[PDB]
Design a protein around this ligand. Structure first.
Ligand SMILES: [Cl-]
Ligand SMILES: [Cl-]
Ligand SMILES: [K+]
Length: 164
């Protein structure tokens, strides 16, 4: 298990433009295209992202490419964000992964507002953090995935992704 396989499990792989859980145009391995209700718009973002006129369909290879970019960018944002870098640095590898997961899913900003959980994480109060993490829109809207991530933080193990 690693961040890529983890996210691969949580986001799936689809080669045609589709709507995410929030109703937004996305493709590949959770590659958000736009929050725009316009499919044409999404298609435009896709061609720009890929470098060719795709007509909303991409190859596995292509999906993976945006995936790698997305993961990297997530990590890169974490390091550049003052509200996140410290907790990230304080964590072991597994937990770091759960943080990347979150940021890939809800953007750096959303994650940074998890002030209290962040603080608990930093203090290494695993159980406490986990309960606090669940008191969120995030958990309510995507509870199964959230439970996985939370478990990851609480235990520092990949148990939640163990048989997926
Ligand atoms: Cl992109
Ligand atoms: Cl879910
Ligand atoms: K998805």
């Amino acid at each position: 298990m690693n961040i890529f396989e983890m996210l691969r499990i949580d986001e799936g792989l689809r080669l045609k433009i589709y709507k995410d859980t929030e109703g937004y145009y996305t493709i590949g391995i959770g590659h958000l295209l736009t929050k725009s209700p316009s499919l044409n718009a999404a298609k435009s973002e896709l061609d720009k992202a890929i470098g060719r006129n795709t007509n909303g369909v991409i190859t596995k290879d292509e999906a993976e490419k945006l995936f790698n970019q997305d993961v990297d960018a997530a990590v890169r944002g974490i390091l550049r964000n003052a509200k996140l870098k410290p907790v990230y640095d304080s964590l072991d590898a597994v937990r770091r992964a759960a943080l990347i997961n979150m940021v890939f899913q809800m953007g750096e900003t959303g994650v940074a507002g998890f002030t209290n959980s962040i603080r608990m994480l930093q203090q290494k109060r695993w159980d406490e953090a986990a309960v606090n993490l669940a008191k969120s829109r995030w958990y309510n809207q995507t509870p199964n995935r959230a439970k996985r991530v939370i478990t990851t933080f609480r235990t520092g193990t990949w148990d939640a992704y163990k048989n997926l």
